[PDB]
Amino acid sequence: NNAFIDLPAPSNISSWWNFGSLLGICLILQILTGLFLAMHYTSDTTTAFSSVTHICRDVNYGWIIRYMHANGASMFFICLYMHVGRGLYYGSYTFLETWNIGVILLLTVMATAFMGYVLPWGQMSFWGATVITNLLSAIPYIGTNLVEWIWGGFSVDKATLTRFFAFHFILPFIIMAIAMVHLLFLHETGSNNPTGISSDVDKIPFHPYYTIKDILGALLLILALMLLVLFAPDLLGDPDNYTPANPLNTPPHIKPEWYFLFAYAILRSIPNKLGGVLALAFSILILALIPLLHTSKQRSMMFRPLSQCLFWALVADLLTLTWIGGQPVEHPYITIGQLASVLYFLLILVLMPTAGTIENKLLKW
Amino acid sequence: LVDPLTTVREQCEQLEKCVKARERLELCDERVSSRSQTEEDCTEELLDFLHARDHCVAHKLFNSLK
Amino acid sequence: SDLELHPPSYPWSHRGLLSSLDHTSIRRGFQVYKQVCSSCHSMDYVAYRHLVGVCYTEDEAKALAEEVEVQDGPNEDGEMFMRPGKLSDYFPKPYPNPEAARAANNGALPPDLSYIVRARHGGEDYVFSLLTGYCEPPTGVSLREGLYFNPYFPGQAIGMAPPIYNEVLEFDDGTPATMSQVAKDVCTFLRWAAEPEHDHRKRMGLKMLLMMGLLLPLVYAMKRHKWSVLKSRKLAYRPPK
Amino acid sequence: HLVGVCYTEDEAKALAEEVEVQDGPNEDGEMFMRPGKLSDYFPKPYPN
Amino acid sequence: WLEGIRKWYYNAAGFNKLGLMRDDTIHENDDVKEAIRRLPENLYDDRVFRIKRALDLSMRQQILPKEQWTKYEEDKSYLEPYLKEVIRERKEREEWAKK
Amino acid sequence: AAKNVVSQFVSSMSASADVLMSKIEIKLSDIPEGKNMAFKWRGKPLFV
Amino acid sequence: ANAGDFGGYYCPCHGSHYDASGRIRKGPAPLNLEVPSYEFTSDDMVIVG
Amino acid sequence: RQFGHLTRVRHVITYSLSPFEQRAFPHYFSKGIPNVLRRTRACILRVAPPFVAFYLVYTWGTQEFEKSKRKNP
Amino acid sequence: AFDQGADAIYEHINEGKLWKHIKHKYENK
Ligand SMILES: CCCCCCCC/C=C/CCCCCCCC(=O)OC[C@H](COP(=O)(O)OCCN)OC(=O)CCCCCCC/C=C/CCCCCCCC
Ligand code: HEC
Ligand code: HEM
Ligand code: HEM
Ligand SMILES: C/C=C(C)/C=C/C=C/[C@H](OC)[C@@H](C)[C@@H](OC)[C@@H](C)CCc1oc2c(O)c(OC)cc(OC)c2c(=O)c1C
Ligand SMILES: CCCCCCO[C@@H]1O[C@H](CO)[C@@H](O)[C@H](O)[C@H]1O
Ligand SMILES: CCCCCCO[C@@H]1O[C@H](CO)[C@@H](O)[C@H](O)[C@H]1O
Ligand SMILES: CCCCCCO[C@@H]1O[C@H](CO)[C@@H](O)[C@H](O)[C@H]1O
User: Fold this and answer.
1) Contact (Cβ atoms closer than 8 angstroms) between residue A17 and residue A74
2) What pairs with residue A205 in β-bridges?
3) The CATH number of the domain where H6 resides is what?
4) Where is the Cytochrome c domain (chain C)?
């Protein structure tokens, strides 16, 4: 009660507000499947890949737990991006504390998924570990030292894998605690709603209205997840990780996990090391700047046509970046990627705030 | 013993798309072989031909296999 | 070259959403692996016991294991020794290590095939096209010694000479061993080897669809039931004039 | 491990070299013998 | 005609389809919350009802019959005088704080 | 006390004793003209 | 090796092209590939380190 | 935030029916489809253009990439 | 009933392909 059952909720929140509970479900499903995997996984580089195949081949139902964990990570990101998109479109980021904790949640889930991906020790695992940890080398003076410290050596090796298993194991739990704070902060104000207008004059109890909508949403999430696990378990994965890590050879068409492609396209768009790492970091941290770039007198984009167009341009641009990240660094992809990367920051830093101001003038305030 | 693959390939090579591809390939062969020095080869023409032919073969072959 | 030729889509009998693998085909495919592929390719994650109930009976798989000799021990004197294989043994590796493998294959390394189908874009369509796709190099192409032209292989120059051809082996069921038939069965077997859970996941998929086909409309009806109270509510504003 | 405890690095190197340890595989995929080195562990008197 | 585009924008924005007035859609910061508190009872009760009606329509994913849409020519700022004063008062306090 | 304890823990994550640089000898005759040969050396590819 | 626009090397991760000298020619890499200490000895042997 | 302390509301009357007295899918299709059509039209000019642009860049780019790899583009 | 019915559908869709369907050819205990 007054924490759940009698929690006052806007009477008009749509399906876009289901993603918060879906993220919670994703987290729990990842933790449960992950724990069962951890019961059979060994992190020694000589047995990591083998232990994963053993889970998939000889552990009763090991394959289903393994593919649920893998596709669960994808479902997690789909829900994350929807969740963030909802927040941007509806002006939810004005709940500053909740939004900033959200930004930290995003970075932590990204770090977590990255490390988990290294555990099977396939080719993508090894090179992913190499490239991502090396992002720290762009830091002046101490970068290289930080990398080798993280690695526990001069290269990704045994020490790296063992500590990544320990980090992967504990981070989800830290994520859960942080998510609880994310919620505590949200309960102080209650939810925003599609109109962006206070809904204090029309609240309804969380139960039964949203408890039942949440269950329905959860069923559709389970449906999406199981359709992937039971009918296309490898659809969202990379065939290259079915090949054990080979430190003397980087696959020629290597590419990141699909949910990282846009950021990868951005980093890859800049022919400068520090420049790319800074843009990659900024592509995510710009989220923390959105609240400061809000110029509109109205909270939600529902009543702002110009902002909506730009918002959808941004979504289409992230789709463009996601597509480019999946292509070779060759013409005309190099240029499309650089333009898309420029557009991304242009939309967020200039065009959207400008549109906000223009709409204000059109409404005479 | 006759592999149906041989049969199916012959029938498939009859299609216009394959005959056209085969002709561009034979043209390339002539052009390339007539030289002593050239960095050109006919891989492109061959792949175009194989693509047209194997697409057809894939639609029929398994009807002959157990 | 940098050009790519993607494999077409074959109508595998296990291609459909609810379509299982053809187990007689898996059985023949194993024979192909056993007589042909195994002399150069390992299959590290498959053991004889895995064949039981899939394509061979327990007794047949036991006899297959016994056809080979595997090192065991140490014995009481601290010696390694040879013994007939058994169900728990994994398929024998053709080479002690990848270096020996490369040395015995002009520098090229025959990859392990336990997952080849899942480790290659195209899956069995790719392996099938590769296996039945060798041809003479196009005019202008010259491959270094040891390499063969295969249009489906990246770069078109592969270090594996065509491994199958008409009558490369005799099947236990009389099936005409043409090259394409042999390719089709070994591909089916490779799919199973890379994904033994294949048939089970589709059977569960069927049950999952049936359950969701029931539960989704039911929960949706419950949602509409509860919400009807808000969906039809009417508001009136009556301020004192 | 002996370096800086009871032997200098050069002395410990010489000690390691007093033994032949198996290494490889080489280019032909065969195991081979080589002089021991600092990173090698003390040789086992028996295989098992 | 800036006004041509304004009326077009007003209708494209569409809060009028929910029977809302422009001021009903303002993002409520502290200045705005104080201005609302200062509203005379009738204006306050009217704002409350237009918002309740809009939230109810939004919930049903419906809009009002076109004859009831707020009209561009009739939408006037009932909040402006209160909000302007609240903002002037706060600016005054800040000046004194700076001293 | 805090400075020592913290640095000891931070130090535990740095390369352990077993990870710390043997030279490597390579036979040039085994590498044909035009070929790039890779070797694992000090935990990284060494190209000759 | 033997990939990229300079016949040297091509890094597939983000598109750095190096020439046959290991020098960075295009892409985001900031430095030429590292040249270690080495000495040519008797026969056809090189000692790196 | 709890009911009883949310905000001040005066002179509003709400009328509701028990769920057991009403249909859960009133005019589901007869009024539902039309509303879905209205809502679709109301946003397509805002949502579709960017994705058509993506679709255009994608086909142009993919085709431009393919043409650039052959002998006679 | 659900499990048996579903399995029947599955086995029918895959008639003659499953081990249970060809098993008799190799057994005989
Ligand atoms: C959760 C907080 C994490 C922050 C770190 C916690 C540190 C706690 C502070 C310690 C207070 C207790 C005093 C201990 C005196 C130990 C004397 C000491 O430091 O000797 C140094 C010596 C190294 O000497 P050398 O290798 O020869 O050369 C040094 C030159 N490079 O290091 C030691 O002896 C290690 C001492 C281990 C301390 C035990 C850890 C205690 C941690 C507790 C965390 C929880 C909080 C408890 C509250 C603190 C109450 C005082
Ligand atoms: C030794 C004489 C071989 C026999 C017998 C078979 N294969 Fe092979 N195979 C061999 C080599 C040396 C290579 C490496 C090729 C290279 O240049 O890298 C291969 C490769 C394959 C591949 C992988 C191709 C790829 O995309 O990397 C596959 C899938 C493959 N071989 C299949 C295969 C099967 C099923 C065989 C029996 C019918 C078979 N090979 C036999 C060497 C030899
Ligand atoms: C582990 C990941 C996360 C979890 C479990 C989580 C969970 C939730 C939940 C349960 C809610 C309330 C339900 C809802 O409105 O959807 C919520 C609201 C919210 N979350 Fe998150 N969240 C996560 C990540 C994020 C991220 C990455 C952001 C943004 C960068 C964010 C921003 C918000 C905001 C602003 C709200 C309020 C939205 C509104 O009221 O309109 N969340 N979240
Ligand atoms: C936020 C929650 C989590 C995310 C997003 C996540 C994601 C992932 C990802 C992407 C992989 C790689 C899967 C693959 O392709 O094989 C992975 C692997 C793994 N994860 Fe997690 N994980 C989460 C939680 C956990 C937890 C809590 C545990 C353990 C207590 C765990 C244990 C494992 C193990 C043992 C592996 C290696 C086996 C495998 O690859 O499937 N994970 N995780
Ligand atoms: C000890 C823990 C550590 C060091 C964790 C650090 C985590 C850092 C970030 O998360 C906060 C990071 C995951 C996040 O950056 C914002 C991602 C979007 C980065 C995406 C990313 O992925 C790649 C990848 O996956 C690959 O795999 C095969 C290969 C890759 O190139 C070859 C990349 C790559 O070029 C980039 C930019
Ligand atoms: C739900 C939409 C899925 C789009 C189908 C293609 O999906 C893509 O397939 C590639 C290989 O086939 C993968 O490497 C890639 O990660 C994956 O996103
Ligand atoms: C996104 C494109 C914005 C163009 C400005 C809209 O302009 C408006 O268009 C209406 C319908 O065409 C006209 O009836 C109206 O008079 C005109 O001002
Ligand atoms: C949530 C923020 C509440 C702001 C309350 C402002 O309150 C106002 O402050 C003025 C000072 O300039 C006073 O003159 C005025 O009488 C008072 O009502």
Assistant:
1) no
2) A8
3) 1.20.5.210
4) 24-125
Nearest CA to H49 out of C81, A295, A305, G44 is that of: A305
Residue A63 is part of which domain span?
1-365
Q: Nearest Cα to D26, choosing from C159, F27, C41?
A: F27
CB of A18 closer than 8 Å to CB of C223 = no
Expressed as residue numbers, the domain containing H20 is 1-73
Phi-psi map region of E71: left, alpha, beta (phi>0 left; psi -120 to 50 alpha)? beta
Subunit contact E13:A305, Cβ cutoff 8 A: yes
Given G2, G12, G13, G14, the catalytic residue: G14
Cis peptide before D25 (omega within 30 of 0): yes
Residues C91 and C173 grouped into a single domain: yes
Residue ranges of E strands in chain A: 8-10, 203-205
Residues of C in CB contact (< 8 Å) with H are 2-3, 221, 224-226, 228-230, 232-240
**CATH architecture, domain defined by E1-99:** Orthogonal Bundle (1.10)
Distance between first and last Cα of chain C: 86
Angle at E98 between CA E95 and CA E99, to 5 degrees: 95
Instruction: Mark whether C26 and C83 lie in a shared domain.
Output: yes
Determination approach: X-ray
Domain count, chain H: 1
Residues C90 and C207 in one domain: no
Helix (H, G, I), strand (E, B) or coil at I14: coil
Question: What's the N-to-C CA distance of chain G in angstroms?
Answer: 22
* C213/C188 same-domain check: no
Residue A132 carries which side chain, given as an amino acid letter? I
- Told to judge if A50 belongs to the known catalytic residues of this protein, a careful annotator would answer no
Q: How far apart are the first and last CA of chain H?
A: 67
Burial of A256 (0-12, 13-18, 19+ CB in 10 A): buried
- CA of E8 relative to ligand 7 center, distance in Å: 6
| Strand-by-strand arrangement of the F24-27 sheet | F24-27, G45-48, G38-40
H-helix or E-strand spanning residue D21: strand D20-23
Gaps in chain I (C to N over 2.5 angstroms) fall after none
Token couple for C176:
């005409």
Nearest CA in chain G to A334: G15
Say yes or no: C210 and C137 in one domain: no
Range of the domain at C132: 1-196
Q: Say if residue C1 is in the same domain as residue C99.
A: yes
CA-closest residue to ligand 1 atom 41: F5
Task: Please tell me the distance in Å from H71's CA to the nearest CA on chain A.
Answer: 16
Structural domain range at position B19: 1-66
H/E element, A74 = helix A62-90
Strands G7-11 and G16-19: antiparallel
Question: Which chain C residues in 62-81 lie under 8 Å from chain D, judged by CB atoms?
Answer: 74, 78
- Going from the Cα of A131 to the center of ligand 5, the distance in angstroms, rounded, reads 7
Q: Could you tell me the CA-to-CA distances from A205 to A125, E34, F7, G11 in Å, in that order? A: 46, 28, 52, 57
> What is the rounded CA–CA span in Å between residue H55 and residue H60?
8
